[PDB]
């Protein structure tokens with residue numbers, strides 16, 4: 483028993499027919515810029531992988547954001563730079579304006595455009611049913627683009643989505659965990675945040691694809707329409723698979739892992755139980771019912787499936803009646 487393999491149903495051979503220099507981020511040269519052009523103003527935040535500053539381009543007075551990367555691996559650093567460059571100009575993908583060496587830290591520093599973002603705790607307590615569809619379509623444009631350029635995000639969550647609600651502007655940020663989908667390739671299952679890890683990561687299945695991003699988008703949507711943040715609230719990676727299973731049930735969980743000849747961590751024998759699949763109507767109450775509709779549940783239902791192969795792709799998702807009410811773009 484070794485796991486059965488898997489391919490993406492879409493965009494399977496994008497990077498097989500693109501040049502080597504497209505996807506091979508190892509053999510990539512960084513074209514540096516003048517660091518004296520930028521003047522730091524304010525610390526916005528500290529991560530495990532970087533510090534982040536609000537800043538000002540001194541050459542044209544533009545406001546700007548500077549992600550100074552901590553030293554970890556030149557592999558990971560060039561990878562983020564090369565994916566951002568490849569995706570430059572795509573819809574609602576955040577724009578890399580420059581790359582400079584910070585003289586203090588001696589590490590690369592990524593200069594992005596500025597987004598006048600709103601706190602996500604303030605924002606998900608205020609979105610109307612229309613706003614939720616609007617921005618979900620906007621994230622979908624971004625996901626289908628990056629998938630169509632042969633790149634999975636692997637860290638889709640509300641913190642990584644900057645929304646300027648004033649101008650209805652949206653931008654998908656932090657491509658630090660993004661990677662190139664190559665068919666047959668086994669990836670590291672230690673990606674994304676806990677609440678938004680799909681079951682493939684949780685059962686240690688390494689041959690995942692673009693559709694991982696769709697599971698996470700489904701988690702984001704569940705919390706927005708049901709007003710439960712986070713929707714699957716697990717204490718650790720083992721309990722996370724149990725919370726999903728209290729909702730989606732264990733019979734379909736076992737079908738999923740038998741289909742790919744995956745064996746569960748023995749520790750599950752003593753915590754997993756047997757759980758009926760629940761109907762989405764149970765999560766509906768007086769305080770979130772204005773956000774729920776038949777078409778919202780239908781869409782959500784097609785995103786939160788165990789089988790990564792049976793999930794809606796980004797393009798199929800954009801075709802759902804859930805988005806019919808949303809205003810498009812003939813002019």
Ligand SMILES: Nc1ncnc2c1ncn2[C@@H]1O[C@H](COP(=O)(O)OP(=O)(O)NP(=O)(O)O)[C@@H](O)[C@H]1O
Pocket residue numbers: 526527528529530531532534547549576594595596597598599641642644655656658
């Ligand atoms: N283009 C941008 N516009 C505005 N704010 C941004 C932008 N990019 C990053 N930020 C800020 O940086 C945060 C996200 O940092 P990210 O780029 O996710 O770095 P990271 O290495 O993942 N760091 P951490 O998440 O903090 O461990 C946001 O909450 C903002 O405060």
Ligand SMILES: [Cl-]
Pocket residue numbers: 670
């Ligand atoms: Cl990795």
